[PDB]
Design a protein around this ligand. Structure first.
Ligand SMILES: Nc1ccc(C(=O)N[C@@H](C(=O)NO)c2ccc(-n3cccn3)cc2)cc1
Ligand SMILES: Nc1ccc(C(=O)N[C@@H](C(=O)NO)c2ccc(-n3cccn3)cc2)cc1
Ligand SMILES: Nc1ccc(C(=O)N[C@@H](C(=O)NO)c2ccc(-n3cccn3)cc2)cc1
Ligand SMILES: [Zn+2]
Ligand SMILES: [Zn+2]
Ligand SMILES: [Zn+2]
Ligand SMILES: [Zn+2]
Ligand SMILES: [Zn+2]
Ligand SMILES: [Zn+2]
Lengths: 518, 514, 512, 95
């Protein structure tokens, strides 16, 4: 529980902001049919023009104000177009003679708006919120979006609006003033109202996971992260248990322990549990990769493009699980038992570090020849999957920044999912669709399995020949699940937003939807 | 057209073996429910042991021979195990006193054998043949295979058995009879002659791919297509530089600029002898050699010595053309396309940064001359859609990124139509040439937005080169069903140091089963 | 104070030779207006020939010897030329009939000789000293040199003549007298002992730099500074980890985290005895060894075996402390600062991506553990400005890019004050340690803008790292004249396989 | 506009010969925007004539004597508004 220090200035806990300015925002949903009120703050219309590519702006919604309605006519709006991402700001006086702010965001020419498109819409909106000291934002939906897409709008709005300033001292912002009220005008409002607080919950679950990932490795270490996980479970009322080295030694988790050997921070295995109240019908184990930092070990990340400075994100799998625990813990689904697992450790270079060629013994008795100390993620997950299967669970779903090859496979937008079961994979894909976190199905090719045949150990950690590292890794993971439905989500490519220089908190909504939609 | 020479010793044609020793093999299929006759040749049993991993060998089938039956009892065969690929064969005299050879090949503990599993068995079997001077091989199937897997067995057996000696010189003779004992033999008989056809289509493509680039050039390869079309009776037309200039195929022509061999656009055609109901265009990448151009393949692992294989897509199309021309399917019109050229380093070569104009008017900013395949395919796809077809399917060793994606076993398929892709995937299953569906992610498309040209050839940032290339290709098909099969990883058999002839059976099953 | 050991054979102190064979050399300066006596030893004439490139040698000086004068006539000397660096030895009997050795060194055809020219002159002369068991060296200046260049001749003569054998278990006759014949001898005499002082300050810096990282560590080096301050008479204080924690020097401490050697902040002080009118703080980068950390110097050309030199800035300041401590200037107060530590790979090491907090409250996102010098200099600079000084000047082997900028001969100087830079440049001319002024380009500053911390350690795009580093440093000086001398390129003499001791004379001329 | 402090509020010094825009360019209204170098906002409104006018600002930082890299950032910020606007006339006021 106590975080070890080298100097007295070393942080002993990960700073966590629970009460975000977003949670202070009062969200009200009105039916657009009853007319719009252009009173205080900024009012933004989400407008499209089907068919006409980059067509003119036409405000369909009825506005309950003669001066604002006259301003927003068609003859005045024709000079602006609905190009996706386009925004405009308006200044005018209403019937009361008050300075009001009005504008719009282009939502393109396509009806059924996409998901990447919506993010561009949201980002465009956030630009209008930034550098402007508003108190209320009013969004008018002159487009049709299903309940899932609507919730996604708020989730993304909250997340992109929110700025992480935990580590600013002298460069904090002077002009950061979040709105206090959010008005939403949409048709058939009563069906969308339920999605607001669902969106707010998903927001923080994602934002919580984002905060953990964003925190540097000196702040976020195996101990402080486990402490933060405990603190989260306590606030939610989840059963929690943190296993230390002695307990892990008795469980004979040789793969997991070997990775953490070179670290000054003791291994910490996180095990949170949510037990729905009543007739538990589904038992689920969520496993997340929890490497607080990945130096690569003696196979040091010294090669160009290894991006060692980024490897604080290597606990994103773990962060996704904890963010989910919040959403699950808050929303309180019924008829489900969920285990949130993460074998947390740090991959470092030391006299105590494990060496290339070292043969270790996993907790299931299988001996593993280490071919590369930088392939540690599959080593920790191996023991984690054994732990998970021992729980007697129905579904085992691991999520991990496992292979860099994912950048060459699916890239930065789509995550890859592997598995040994077609129904479990289909549920992940279905959860991917409704959670609005894109994932693509990749194959586990058994012909490659022969390249893992060790001369001395039971199985090789890595392949010498096959360069399909994403599939080979899955072949390795597949060996540590004997008779349980298992899916593997590789989020190495999608976890970090290279453009925004911040985490996505990817997986939180996907996993939560996976649990809820079951 | 005559192949140009630097010296008189430079070859002017690709040597091709049309009449292979495989074609001389008489195949006989018997039903296993009746006992085996072990008179002549070599007799091999395909045996497994479900449950018992690496279990002992048990010959279930009754053998009509007293001396061989003693050999095949349980007490002697138990000393052998069924580990996948393991084999043993002994030489002995039968009841009449003739020298026969008997043995087995291990087929593992899993029932439903895969194709890689089946391939390993065949390899094990072929090793015994490369060490055999006799006349007959008899294979006894004590394992379960559907009609497709059995046909795949023969296809693979024929393909692996055959040895390419065109470039050798300067210990065996091929068998003349093949005996097969399998259950429900009468249903599998139809697959025998189909397999032999699929065999040569693959092996033909292999010969083209295996042929060095000094032998196989844009001229000699185009000549070979003519030679193939003439033997089959396919409408053929080879477009030269002047016609390609008039068609304004600027991307395609720019790639071949640095080559001493003129560009040759291959257009073969199979028209059914009736009412064409589906019209299909098959486009194949035809780079006879890929040096990479001024973006030279000098980085480690660039494998420039391998880049004769860069015409494998074309080889697949030609191989398919063989099968289609031979099998003669009905109600279909098929166009076999390949923009053939050579990517070389010269004063005449095209440069990085060059902006070129494709035949559809779109300008392309070249970011890397080693990405020449998509440039040639760009014009090839434009040519295809003008043909007015229902399906356009390109196949090409396009991206090395496939090696990190699916590897050397599975090829990747992209497309703009889900039904066409499903037809390809269904075709992958029956041909047993494995393909996995990969996504065209439209979010990446913005990275192809050039500052000066209409579209970028490559992305500066996004390293998912396999998806970006597909995004590029998609720009040259406007309103036609199009699929893209990336076979860069699967085309060459690195362990065996030879081509796979990948795509031939995949594409042929696609046209036939459609 | 006590140096930690892994094995008992690990050294606990930097061997230092204070009394070099150079110091036992009795130096005599005579005015040439009166003739040279070719009595004993080797006598070498420094000769020029204006206009002709490699023209003949003509010895102008009067020699108080009939036979040597006849030998040194024009008809005999014409077969030799004055090509810059050329040397010749002569054998002859003098008037009393004693075997004396005489010769010359070519000084080219150009009047105002440069420094590379003079070094070649000095080096060529040293060659005659190394293969000869001589007892006396007499140098006659038949060329024109200002008082400053003359001192440099002696400086370079002393430094190159001297051989460092501290780490030899083998070995293998320094001269005891040095005679100098020059016109206006009475003005050059004052430069004689000044050169000897500048010499050792330089040679002192060389010894510290040349000393391997197992000998010269944060503790042993800090001990040497204490030892140095004591042999002088400077107020000294070495801050250890506990007080540095209370001063909250988080950037500096993070770099030393992975080391077996505790951080040691060197703070020597020279306070004049009168009305201190200028207060100066000299900060030196003090990395006793630079492994690069988790961003290990594993790439080809990283020259990791050289990274013992990464304390050259500190060695320069200490060398300055010696010269200043010896010459004792008036009306000046000088603080000699150096945040000494070791950048190593360990479980305790700081990681890439780590956010640390400097002593001025600014949070820093570490992008590369091999950019540790600016991290240590940041806290050192905050400490420096707290002293309330007029000038803050740091000197450091900070960026390897300097080899691509100015190379190995010229050092780069950056700053936020133009008058301070001109004084540094002015010192470069008189110290004869070449320095070129480089710009701090504010357009690059945006590349140091961190997403989470106050400021980034490194830039993502811009490869002008020497400038980027300077932009980082500028953030830790709020309202004080500050100059930064990047000596990564000039610190090591790659051809001679030894340190240059660069910066010592430059800084001393700046103070004095 | 600049604010000699750092990322401080926007204050329009210039007198505007328009009652409606002057109301917009008031201190109470421009205070919500800051002068960070390159930051910009433009609004659309009707003037006294009831014509659609577009008004805005570009932040020129807190330093007086603008550099050359500084001016480019200002210009780019200005150019972005031109590329996203079907305007006919651009008016730049140098405060
Ligand atoms: N021989 C091998 C095979 C696979 C790997 C591999 O997949 N490494 C992982 C890793 O570090 N696991 O702990 C990996 C490397 C880079 C990235 N990466 C993700 C964004 C950028 N880079 C992700 C995962 C390494 C070495
Ligand atoms: N900037 C880029 C982007 C993509 C590529 C690329 O995919 N290149 C292709 C190619 O050169 N096609 O002609 C490629 C590279 C490697 C391989 N390869 C296949 C088996 C081994 N290597 C195949 C194709 C090259 C440069
Ligand atoms: N991404 C970066 C950017 C700059 C540096 C850098 O400045 N490295 C310095 C250094 O060691 N700082 O502590 C550096 C590197 C090489 C040399 N070098 C000097 C003689 C030869 N090489 C000197 C300094 C390192 C990594
Ligand atoms: Zn790793
Ligand atoms: Zn990892
Ligand atoms: Zn290429
Ligand atoms: Zn190619
Ligand atoms: Zn360094
Ligand atoms: Zn350094």
């Amino acid at each position: 529980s106590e975080v070890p220090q080298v100097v007295s200035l070393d942080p002993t806990s990960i700073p966590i902001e629970y009460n975000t300015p977003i949670h202070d925002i009062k969200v009200q949903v009105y039916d657009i049919k009853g007319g719009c009120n252009v009173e205080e703050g900024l009012t933004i219309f989400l407008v499209n023009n089907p068919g006409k590519e980059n067509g003119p702006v036409k405000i369909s919604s009825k506005v309950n104000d003669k001066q604002v309605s006259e301003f927003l006519k068609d003859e005045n709006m024709e000079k602006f177009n609905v190009k996706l991402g386009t925004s405009k700001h308006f200044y005018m006086f209403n019937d009361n003679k008050n300075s009001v702010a009005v504008g719009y965001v282009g939502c393109g020419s396509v009806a059924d708006l996409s998901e990447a498109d919506m993010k561009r819409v949201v980002l465009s909106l956030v630009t209008m919120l930034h550098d402007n000291k508003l108190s209320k934002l009013t969004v008018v939906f002159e487009i049709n979006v299903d309940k899932n897409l609507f919730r996604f709008f708020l989730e993304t709005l909250f997340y992109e609006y929110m700025t992480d300033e935990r580590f600013k001292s002298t460069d904090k912002n002077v002009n950061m003033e979040y709105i206090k009220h959010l008005g939403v005008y949409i048709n058939n409002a009563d069906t969308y109202k339920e999605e607001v607080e669902k969106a707010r919950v998903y927001y923080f679950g994602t934002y919580y996971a984002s905060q953990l990932i964003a925190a540097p490795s000196n702040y976020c270490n195996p101990v402080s992260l486990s402490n933060a996980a405990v603190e989260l479970a306590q606030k939610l009322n989840l059963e929690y248990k943190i296993l230390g080295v002695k307990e892990l030694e008795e469980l004979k988790m040789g793969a997991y322990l070997s990775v953490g050997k070179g670290s000054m921070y003791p291994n910490k295995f996180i095990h949170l549990t949510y037990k729905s109240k009543g007739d538990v019908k589904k038992k689920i184990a969520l496993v997340g990769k929890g490497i607080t930092f990945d130096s690569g070990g003696y196979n040091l990340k010294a090669a160009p493009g290894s991006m060692i400075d980024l490897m604080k994100f290597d606990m994103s799998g773990c962060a996704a699980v904890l963010g989910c625990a919040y959403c699950v813990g808050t929303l309180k689904p019924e008829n489900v038992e969920i285990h949130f697992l993460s074998a947390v450790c740090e991959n470092m270079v030391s006299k105590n570090s494990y060496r290339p060629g070292d043969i270790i013994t996993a907790s299931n008795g299988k001996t593993i020849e280490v071919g590369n100390t930088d392939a540690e993620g599959r080593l920790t997950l191996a023991d984690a999957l054994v732990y998970a299967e021992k729980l007697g669970v129905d579904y085992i779903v691991d999520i991990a920044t496992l292979t860099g090859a994912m950048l060459y496979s699916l890239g930065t937008s789509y995550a890859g999912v592997f598995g040994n079961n077609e129904e479990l994979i289909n549920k992940i894909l279905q959860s991917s669709k409704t959670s609005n976190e894109p994932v693509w199905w990749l194959p586990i090719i058994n012909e490659y399995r022969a390249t893992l045949n060790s001369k001395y150990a039971d199985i090789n950690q890595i392949s010498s020949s096959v360069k399909a590292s994403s599939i080979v890794a899955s072949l390795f993971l597949k060996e540590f699940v004997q008779n349980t439905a298992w899916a593997h989500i590789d989020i190495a490519g999608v976890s970090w937003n290279f453009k925004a220089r911040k985490p996505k908190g990817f997986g939180v909504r996907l996993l939560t939807e996976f649990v809820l939609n079951d």
